[PDB]
Amino acid sequence: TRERLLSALEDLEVLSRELIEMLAISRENQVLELLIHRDGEFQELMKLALNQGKIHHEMQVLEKEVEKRDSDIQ
Amino acid sequence: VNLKQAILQAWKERWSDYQWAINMKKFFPKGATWDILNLADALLEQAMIGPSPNPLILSYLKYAISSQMVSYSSVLTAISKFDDFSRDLCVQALLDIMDMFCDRLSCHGKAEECIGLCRAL
Amino acid sequence: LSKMSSLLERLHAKFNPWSETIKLVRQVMEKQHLVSCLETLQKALKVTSLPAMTDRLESIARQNGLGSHLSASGTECYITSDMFYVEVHHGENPVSCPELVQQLREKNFDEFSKHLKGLVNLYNLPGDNKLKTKMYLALQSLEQDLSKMAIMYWKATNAGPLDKILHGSVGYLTPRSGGHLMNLKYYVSPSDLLDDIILHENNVSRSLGMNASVTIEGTSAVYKLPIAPLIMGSHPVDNKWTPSFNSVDLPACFFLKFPQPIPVSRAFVQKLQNCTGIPLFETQPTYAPLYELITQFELSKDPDPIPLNHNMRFYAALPGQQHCYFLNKDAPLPDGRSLQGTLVSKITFQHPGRVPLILNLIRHQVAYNTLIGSCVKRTILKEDSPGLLQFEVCPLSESRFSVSFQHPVNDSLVCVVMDVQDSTHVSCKLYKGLSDALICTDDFIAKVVQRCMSIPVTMRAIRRKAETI
Amino acid sequence: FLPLVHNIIKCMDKDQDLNALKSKFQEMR
Lengths: 74, 121, 469, 29
Fold this sequence. Notes:
This is part of a larger assembly, with chains A, B, C and D. By secondary structure, chain B is mainly α. Chain B contains 7 helices and no strands. By secondary structure, chain D is an all-alpha fold. In chain D, α1 (2-14) packs antiparallel against α2. At the B-C interface, α1 of B face β15, β16 and β17 of C. Chain B: This is Mediator of RNA polymerase II transcription subunit 24. Chain B: Belongs to the Mediator complex subunit 24 family.
């Protein structure tokens, strides 16, 4: 999932840069379709990315609590 | 079984006139020259129901005259029993059917068939 | 494949930068219309806050090849010819259309784009300049006269919307709003009034029926059209039109464009011409059997990849019984020529005086098409032993057809000849042999058809009524 | 991410190199 998101990010950056550069040289629906497809992938997993971090902080708190309980029990 | 049911099956599944002739032979082992069974009467009844005749059953009757299935006498009697006369299209169809065999009008059979042709004329 | 080649090119660029590419572009500049069009495409996919939504409105302008001038952030105007409108020639800004305002306030920039397209098409008018302004004035006079004629019918009879659409002078008329031009609803079929028993109310949908649009369009020939409202004096019953000349010989005529071309028969062309006189098809094009065209219109209402390959033997499945209908095109009419007709999309009328007569003929031709149209279906009825009652439709004469079926109880063929005398009125006679079982009462069949809809349906009622007796 | 890429495309349409460098920094982000 992290790998998929990173791959989508790299593809988006390179293809957007190429399309903009071709526009600049002149004065690309294939690139456009690729952009919207990986944009959907990143956006749908960006709501996830934010919540994941909040969940991770909660998990860290839970872990600390469990550790204390065990050490106390021991 | 009846001639009306055979003609009506011939209308239901679209049969061309020669396939109608073959299947009409197959439905009835005794031919009885087809005039004992009154082919011309049944074909005219179920052709002249609408304001205009259905061209299928008229095609059947024109084949049954041009091929010598049906004698001219039975056709001329069945034409004679139509009247109604309010519809010009059925009357024009009957006059084209009469235009087929008239001036020819040649019975080749018994003399009673020739007398029948006389009364039919 | 193309994407793989592009990735390989990106790998080559990595081996070789974006900064270098920018420098190369700058060198080329130191050393266009497609790039402008491309800007609109990537600015259409851009979607952000109000500032960028104003740049999305600028994108909409260049997308339709329009010119945008903005005074302050609040007001931006797209201007071409007389098609100038502002989201905050020869006329005041007509209205703050709720339709346009609602779409913009909500997130529907696409709907606003469609509305501009409609406005551009209405003013695709060739003409020149002062002529265009006069030509638009003529359309305004026609619209005012048609609106008044509709009002007269409502004053004379307080008819419900359904009555106005089916049997009224002009038709239910919606005045032009933005791009959309006036729509007169010629006919609302009984089957389609019912959806999955709709009551129209004054909320009648724009597309819930058959609709025709009134518009001005340029023609090669030159014609005289009213440039001012011609119903200055109206006789209380029906209408009276003051005679021409005011008027001018603009090289165009009023039109009654139909969104989907309506198949029309040769006889109708003569009956319609008798009134107007303007050649309906002018340059004589093609003219084949009408029943084939009726099938194409009905089959193409819903599009599917596989052609039906009907062979004019459409199969219909109904709640009780199964029916197969052969449309019998090529049956000779009394003249000896099969019913032949050509799709008509545009009908041109100078004044609205001949319009009541032209519409009455069209309503009759549309009604006949709908009753025969109801049968056309995409049925794969293969190897059907039970039922498969088989009926054949023959063209007896223009405006008449005969559905022939075996007698439900007895054995002789029985034929119902239906003539579409008027758009909403069909007269049918059952032909039955001298010795036969009374199949049906013509009134009971009529009651069932009017309460429900279509003609594949009429044959069911004839069979059921006979069986019940 | 996609907004920054579209802004870079808009800059290309207007024309810069600094904006492309900003897009690379956005990729690092």
